[PDB]
TrEMBL record:
Keyword Transmembrane among record annotations: no
Reaction equation(s) it catalyzes: a 3-oxosteroid + A = a 3-oxo-Delta(1)-steroid + AH2
Sorted UniProt keywords: FAD, Flavoprotein, Lipid metabolism, Nucleotide-binding, Oxidoreductase, Steroid metabolism
Binding site for FAD: E50, T58, S59, G63, A64, S65, L208, N271, D274, L460, N490, L507
Pfam families the record matches: FAD_binding_2
Residues of the FAD-dependent oxidoreductase 2 FAD-binding domain: 22-507
SUPFAM superfamilies from the UniProt entry: FAD/NAD(P)-binding domain, Succinate dehydrogenase/fumarate reductase flavoprotein, catalytic domain
InterPro entries: FAD-dep_OxRdtase_2_FAD-bd (IPR003953), FAD-oxidoreductase_2 (IPR050315), FAD/NAD-bd_sf (IPR036188), Succ_DH/fumarate_Rdtase_cat_sf (IPR027477)
Example GO molecular function: 3-oxosteroid 1-dehydrogenase activity
GO aspect biological process, one term: steroid metabolic process
Name of the protein in its database record: 3-oxosteroid 1-dehydrogenase
Length: 523
């Protein structure tokens, strides 16, 4: 499959519609299902198309922190926050560029949440996770909401259809004993809500192939399910929330997107730009394709990565064995700083230096979390009883590494990182449990043996794609809208530009613009 557009007159030379619906939704992420619910709940027949054999995609893998501020959820917690406070934070970071979509995101949040919580399968709650930048309107505790843990039993036959967490999915496993949490809860509840409307069809192994145009309006889509080809009519429109280009190496090389497909934490084979491609075909503009939701990734034996989040020890060096960033930085800034510092391989990979403080464990949350033994067997990590020998085994300058570590250890005993101010932020301190020092983020690495872990530039999906308006309408280069086509999530170029403002902005933008697209289609 390439994603070439059909004219209906052309297809009318032999074929005819194999199905029909008011709202066709391509994908089954947070956005897709939120747009599907918005449409089905108010009477529009909806068909949801999931390419793989599991609903949720990267949204299922997520922790389902959602940046929808100023809502009834934050009020129940008595949060010192408001729609206007949130608007200020976004303006202070992104500027006036895309200010209309900024306004729409922050202004629509409450309505999205009111509608979804109204369903008996959906309820959210505030959970503390700090916003990620020092700027007016920042929330040091955060303002993001999560779905409640869900007993799989409460959604029947939909639980087995939800994509399992990364610690199970990249190892041929299903959901474990632990109840549906984070992204698994988000998708389980939204599938249940969407089903409960009695106006929606949920399909797996149904792949978008081409949009169908008639007189320059999108009227439906070519789909591939069970060997054969289907032509699905869409009376009001098609919503494309099938993710980004994260799994398509060629589209990334072309755009100049840093990182690699094999490093992305998107489900292997799922998000390959199918929708973005299909949208360009029918005349859609694109932006920001070189941009991603970046994160450090712990390189794996199989050459893929694990999301490294909530760092609470060690330090990181370039190929010169010298710290170049605040290891406790939020993951998108961490990653962008690796990219900036890279002189043809000096920083990608970087090397995370740690000791036996965590009995051989890397002092951070790795998702998924491979056993140290497997890393050491494979040579992604390296271990030694001395820094001299560790530098030998890793090809790091031994004089430099040893200076870097003596200097870091000095700052740990002092309590301040003169070079990179590590631990001096509410995010940095959020993951650090108090030790016996003056700074919980700085812990001396003098306990043997010492380990070196290769860190690459991973991602949580791309954020470049089709240009959209405040209603998720796909636009041509001239600014005109392509009637019948709407895009959201990572299929749509982020209003957030080169910024990850705080936890849940991906799912948050996805859910608001998916919702707004349905509202537009309701007309
Ligand atoms: C471990 C982890 C934690 C994260 N935590 C959070 C968090 O807490 N909060 C947050 O906001 N973000 C978080 N993120 C990021 C977030 O998961 C993604 O950026 C977001 O879910 C992207 O949603 P999407 O709709 O763009 O993609 P997805 O959720 O992946 O949805 C895309 C779906 O479309 C399907 N699809 C693709 N092509 C086609 C086609 N042609 N036809 C039909 N279907 C197709 C795919 O199979 C997939 O099922 C996290 C990421 C990871 C890896
Ligand atoms: C799972 C459990 O029992 O507790 C462990 C945890 O806290 C998690 O693993 C949860 C699965 C969600 C949580 C957070 C939620 C907020 C968030 C939103 C984003 O968009 C990016 C990802 C983060 C920063 C998140 O770090 C991931 C993963 C952790 C740390």
């Amino acid at each position: 499959h390439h994603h070439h557009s059909q004219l209906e007159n052309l297809y009318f030379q032999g074929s005819d519609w194999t199905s029909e619906c008011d709202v066709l939704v391509v994908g089954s992420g947070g956005g897709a299902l939120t747009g599907a619910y918005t449409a089905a709940a108010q009477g529009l027949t909806t068909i949801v198309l999931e390419k793989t054999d599991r609903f949720g995609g990267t949204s299922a893998y997520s922790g389902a922190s959602i940046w929808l501020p100023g809502t009834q959820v934050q009020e129940r917690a008595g949060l010192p926050d408001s729609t206007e406070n949130a608007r200020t934070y976004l303006r202070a970071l992104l500027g006036d560029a895309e200010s209309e979509r900024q306004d729409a995101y922050v202004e629509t949040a409450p309505a999205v949440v009111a509608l979804l919580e109204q369903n008996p399968n959906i309820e959210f709650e505030f959970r503390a996770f700090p916003d990620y930048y020092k700027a007016e309107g920042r929330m040091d505790t955060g303002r993001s909401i999560n779905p409640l843990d869900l007993d799989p039993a409460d959604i029947g036959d939909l639980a087995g259809k939800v994509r399992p967490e990364l610690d199970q999915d990249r190892t041929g496993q299903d959901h474990a004993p632990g109840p549906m949490i984070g992204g698994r809860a988000l998708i389980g509840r939204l599938l249940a809500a969407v089903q409960s409307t009695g106006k929606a069809e949920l399909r797996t192994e149904s792949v978008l192939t081409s949009l169908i145009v008639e007189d320059g309006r999108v009227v439906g889509a070519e789909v591939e399910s069970g060997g054969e080809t289907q032509r699905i009519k869409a009376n009001r429109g098609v919503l494309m929330a099938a993710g980004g280009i994260e799994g398509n190496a060629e589209m990334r090389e072309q755009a100049g997107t840093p990182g690699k497909a094999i490093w992305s934490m998107g489900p292997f084979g799922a998000n390959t730009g199918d929708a973005i491609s299909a949208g360009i075909a029918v005349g859609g503009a694109t932006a920001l394709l070189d941009q991603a939701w970046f994160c450090p990734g712990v390189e794996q034996p199989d050459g893929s990565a694990a999301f490294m989040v909530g760092v609470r020890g060690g330090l990181v060096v370039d190929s010169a064995g010298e710290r170049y960033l605040n290891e406790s930085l939020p993951y998108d800034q961490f990653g962008r700083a690796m990219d900036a510092h890279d002189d043809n391989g000096s920083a990608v990979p970087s090397f995370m230096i740690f000791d036996s403080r965590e009995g051989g464990g890397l002092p951070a949350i790795c998702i998924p979390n491979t056993a140290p033994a497997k890393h050491l067997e494979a040579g992604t990590w390296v271990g030694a009883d001395t820094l001299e020998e560790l530098a030998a085994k890793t090809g790091l300058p031994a004089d430099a590494l040893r200076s870097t570590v003596e200097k870091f250890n000095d700052a740990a005993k002092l309590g301040v990182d003169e070079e990179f101010h590590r631990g001096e932020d509410p995010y940095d301190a959020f993951f650090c449990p108090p030790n016996g020092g003056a700074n919980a983020a700085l812990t001396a690495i003098e306990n043997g043996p010492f380990y070196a872990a290769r860190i690459v530039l991973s991602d949580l999906g791309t954020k470049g794609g089709l240009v959209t308006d405040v209603n998720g309408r796909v636009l041509r280069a001239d600014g005109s809208a392509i009637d019948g086509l709407y895009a959201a999530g990572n299929t749509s170029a982020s209003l957030s530009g080169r910024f990850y403002p705080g936890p849940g902005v991906p799912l948050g933008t996805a859910m608001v613009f998916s919702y707004r697209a349905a509202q537009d289609m309701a007309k």
